[PDB]
Design a protein around this ligand. Sequence first.
Ligand SMILES: CN(C(=O)CN1Cc2ccc(-c3nc(NC4CCOCC4)ncc3Cl)cc2C1=O)C(C)(C)C
Length: 344
Amino acid sequence: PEMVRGQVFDVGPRYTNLSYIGEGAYGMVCSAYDNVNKVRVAIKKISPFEHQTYCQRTLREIKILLRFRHENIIGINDIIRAPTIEQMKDVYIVQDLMETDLYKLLKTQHLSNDHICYFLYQILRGLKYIHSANVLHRDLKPSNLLLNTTCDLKICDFGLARVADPDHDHTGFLTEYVATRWYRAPEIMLNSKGYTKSIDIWSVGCILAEMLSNRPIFPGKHYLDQLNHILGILGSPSQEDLNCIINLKARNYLLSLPHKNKVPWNRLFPNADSKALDLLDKMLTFNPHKRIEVEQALAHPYLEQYYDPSDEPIAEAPFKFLDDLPKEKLKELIFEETARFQPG
Ligand SMILES: CN(C(=O)CN1Cc2ccc(-c3nc(NC4CCOCC4)ncc3Cl)cc2C1=O)C(C)(C)C
């Protein structure tokens, strides 16, 4: 076994010469030399089995990424694990190695309008595919957009992804939520579980705003502060949009706030392309029913140089598809889902 920053990386024979990339709550990630394909690759050691939510997140990701095949979505190339459930303490997911991500690029680089346009196109092209499979990503943010040296973009991290379920989207006011705060649509805080495709478009809107200025547009410091950052730019919701929020706690909270005027996009983003700002406005619409959909966004004049629906593929096999399952049962499902990659 090779060691990396303490940890064992039981990934040989196939994968050697490991360099440390990073580490998080998920696991540890390295680059490794693939000896069959003669390329360096990413490998993330996941150790989810002692907690049911980490098994949940791991299995969703595996199932989704093995079904999907798209240029703007990270694939799974290989999965390494022990030959028996008993011996399986870790799963290693092998993926194409990307040079950087949009979070790192935005901290260090001014993006040209042409780069913003091309990144946004790629995000939306990937998202068209995801949404065409009846899947929601639910945690779109700069660090989940991987980039290579030629600026090709791939969406990653499907641990919070769900099949869309718009008939069960309603919930109460101030319902707790898992996905990254700064990219949460206003309705999350008001009346939504994040089970509709509109949740992802809001996040993409936030990302486009962040590309224009290198700063997050709505950096809330805590749950309700996120909503009031949103309302500080969008201004007070209209009567019509208020009347769609039937829950009284949520509605009366909004009614209690002083009137706030909209901050014009062209004052927040004085150097931005006007067509970029028109698309931003439509993605960052308060009412999720009025919010632009992914295929409409692709057809927007800002993206005219790239738009080609014949070259913006959809999924062949959408998900028709568990939240109750014990971590011991989810290990079993993870074992089964990864069996195709074993010697056999
Ligand atoms: C939450 N979960 C994850 O796994 C989430 N994460 C963490 C992670 C870390 C790296 C890469 C990655 N990074 C690169 N390159 C980096 C080189 C240095 O600059 C930044 C980019 N290339 C390919 C990949 Cl796959 C992907 C993921 C991912 O999806 C679970 C367990 C699935 C739930």
